[PDB]
C-alpha cells in the first residue's frame, strides 16, 4: 500500500514526537539532534520509515517544503 | 621578614581601562604576582552575560524581521557584546521595546533597578520602517569563563546565545623600581586592566588574590 | 510512484576545533592541534595575546 506520512508512529514515545506537528512534520525553528524524527513516515508491512536526523548533525530547522502528487490529498501542514 | 604589598593607587584612565599599583614588592615577587594575577584575572573573573533571547515573531536566528536592518543572527551577535552589571541576583530578564525609525540601542532597554547598562550607546539593531516595532526579552545570567550554547544542557523561539562571562578583556603588568623609605631593592607592580566596564578593578584584584590564596591553601598544609 | 516529498533544511553552526584545516593564501596549510586558553598564549608588552 501507499506510504503514509503521519504523526502516528508505532514503538516511539510521545516525547520523541513532541517536535512534530499534527501532520507529523517537524516545526519550523525546532532544535534537532542526531536521531530526532523530522518527518514521521510509516511503511506498511506498519514499519517505521520516518526520516530521522543523521547522527551528530544537531541543527535548526529553517525551512520545510512539501511536494504533493496530483490527485493526492495534501496534509494540513501542506 | 618579607615586605608585603599594598594597594597604593588606582588610576581609572577610562570607564573600561584602569591601572592598579601594588607596593612594595621584594625581588622576584613582582613578576610572580604579576603573572599569577594576570592568569587568574584573564581566566576566573565572574561577570554577567546575555544567555537567552526571545524576540516576538521570530522562530530562529536564520531569519529576517520586516523593518529591521540586521538579521536575527547579527542582532544576537550584537546582544552577545552587551555589557551589563546585575546587582543582588544571578539572573535577570530585561525587556526591550522600540518603535519607529532609528537605532535600537542598549539605552532603549526597559530600566531595572538592580540592572545597570554600562554602555548605553551599544547598538543592538536598526529599525528602518515607521510602522516597524521590535520587542524582545533578554536573559542575563552571572557566570565565569566561556560557556557555548551548544554545550549547555525550551520552546521554539528561545534563542541561545554563547556566553562570554569574563568581564576582563586585556591584562598587562609592569615591574618598576619603587623608591622605598631606605631600601633600593624593592619594586612595584602596575597592573593595567581593560575590561568591559562591569567589574570594579579593586574588586577584580581582591577576587584574584582570594582565588590564589584559596588555591594555595592546599599547599600551605601539604598532606 | 512518488506520493509525497517533504524537504527539511537543517542549519548548523560549525565552530572551529582541533582537526579543522586552516590555510593562508601562500600555500601555508595546517591542521589545528590545540585550542589554547588565552592566558597561556604568547603576549606582548601591552598584554595583547596573539
Curated annotation (Swiss-Prot), chain A:
It comes from the Bacteria. Co-administration of salinamide and rifampicin or salinamide and myxopyronin suppresses the emergence of resistance to both antibiotics. Acetylated on several lysine residues in the presence of glucose. Belongs to the RNA polymerase beta chain family. DNA-dependent RNA polymerase (RNAP) catalyzes the transcription of DNA into RNA using the four ribonucleoside triphosphates as substrates. The RNAP catalytic core consists of 2 alpha, 1 beta, 1 beta' and 1 omega subunit. When a sigma factor is associated with the core the holoenzyme is formed, which can initiate transcription. The rRNA transcription and antitermination complex (rrnTAC) consists of RNAP, NusA, NusB, NusE (rpsJ), NusG, SubB, ribosomal protein S4, DNA and precursor rRNA; S4 is more flexible than other subunits. In pull-down experiments interacts with CedA. (Microbial infection) Interacts (via flap domain) with Escherichia phage lambda antitermination protein Q; this interaction renders bacterial RNAP resistant to transcription pausing and allows it to read through termination signals. This is DNA-directed RNA polymerase subunit beta.
Swiss-Prot record, chain B:
Its EC number is 2.7.7.6. GO terms for cellular component: cytoplasm; cytosol; cytosolic DNA-directed RNA polymerase complex; membrane; transcription elongation factor complex. Changing residue 179 to C: In rpoA101; temperature-sensitive. It catalyses: RNA(n) + a ribonucleoside 5'-triphosphate = RNA(n+1) + diphosphate. Keywords: Acetylation, ADP-ribosylation, DNA-directed RNA polymerase, Nucleotidyltransferase, Transcription, Transferase. Changing residue 39 to C: In rpoA112; temperature-sensitive, blocks RNA polymerase assembly. Belongs to the RNA polymerase alpha chain family. DNA-dependent RNA polymerase (RNAP) catalyzes the transcription of DNA into RNA using the four ribonucleoside triphosphates as substrates. This subunit plays an important role in subunit assembly since its dimerization is the first step in the sequential assembly of subunits to form the holoenzyme. Part of the processive rRNA transcription and antitermination complex (rrnTAC). The complex forms an RNA-chaperone ring around the RNA exit tunnel of RNAP. It supports rapid transcription and antitermination of rRNA operons, cotranscriptional rRNA folding, and annealing of distal rRNA regions to allow correct ribosome biogenesis. This is DNA-directed RNA polymerase subunit alpha. The gene is rpoA.
